[PDB]
């Protein structure tokens, strides 16, 4: 049972800007989403600071990163507090209307899409790299759910198939083919090192058989 939605038309503006607009610095992708894995290890931090049982789900507060050149993905695993599945219907939980406005001003004022973070809608910078995302999340006392789109204005959620994950949420990069250099590990590694050194939870780059 797949669920279909249209995108908010702002959102749907956003996706296009980034998919359309020359900007060859795509590798920032990444640090967005690491910064999303950041926060979302964060929540779960803190909700546990008052409730211990809200980590049954995993003690582990970590970030895994995941290439796959035999199915042309880069995976971004976390186990931070996941989201439900309200949550990722109305734009992966993030200000996406407002910060969208917000940051179209911006770029009328003379900022570029690297600066797409600081709106609270760093996660769509994952467009500048991938032909398709997909994002499986698991948060406490929800089901797993599956989000996926590959813009066009629609995305759809399902409740998930597959092997069930703690807590936390992987985002699934589907790489356009011109953008297979982010599975190398030395590209990978040298990105984290240029723009996300100094994190609060552990990265762990796998490598491949």
Request: net charge negative.
């Amino acid at each position: 049972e797949v669920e279909t939605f249209a995108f908010q038309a702002e959102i749907a503006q956003l996706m296009s800007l980034i998919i359309n607009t020359f900007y060859s610095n795509k590798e920032i992708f990444l640090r967005e989403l690491i910064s999303n894995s950041s926060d979302a290890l964060d929540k779960i931090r803190y909700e546990s600071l008052t409730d211990p049982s809200k980590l049954d789900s995993g003690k582990e507060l970590h970030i895994n990163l995941i290439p796959n050149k035999q199915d042309r993905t880069l995976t971004i695993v976390d186990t931070g507090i996941g989201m439900t599945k309200a949550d990722l219907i109305n734009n992966l939980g993030t200000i996406a209307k407002s910060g969208t406005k917000a940051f179209m001003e911006a770029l009328q004022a003379g900022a570029d899409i690297s600066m797409i973070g600081q709106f609270g809608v760093g996660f769509y910078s994952a467009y500048l790299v991938a032909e398709k995302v997909t994002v499986i999340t698991k948060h406490n006392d929800d089901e797993q759910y599956a989000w996926e789109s590959s813009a066009g204005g629609s995305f759809t959620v399902r409740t998930d198939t597959g092997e069930p994950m703690g807590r936390g949420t992987k985002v699934i990069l589907h790489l356009k083919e011109d953008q297979t250099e982010y599975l190398e590990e030395r590209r990978i590694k040298e990105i984290v090192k240029k723009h996300s050194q100094f994190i609060g939870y552990p990265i762990t780059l796998f490598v491949e058989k």
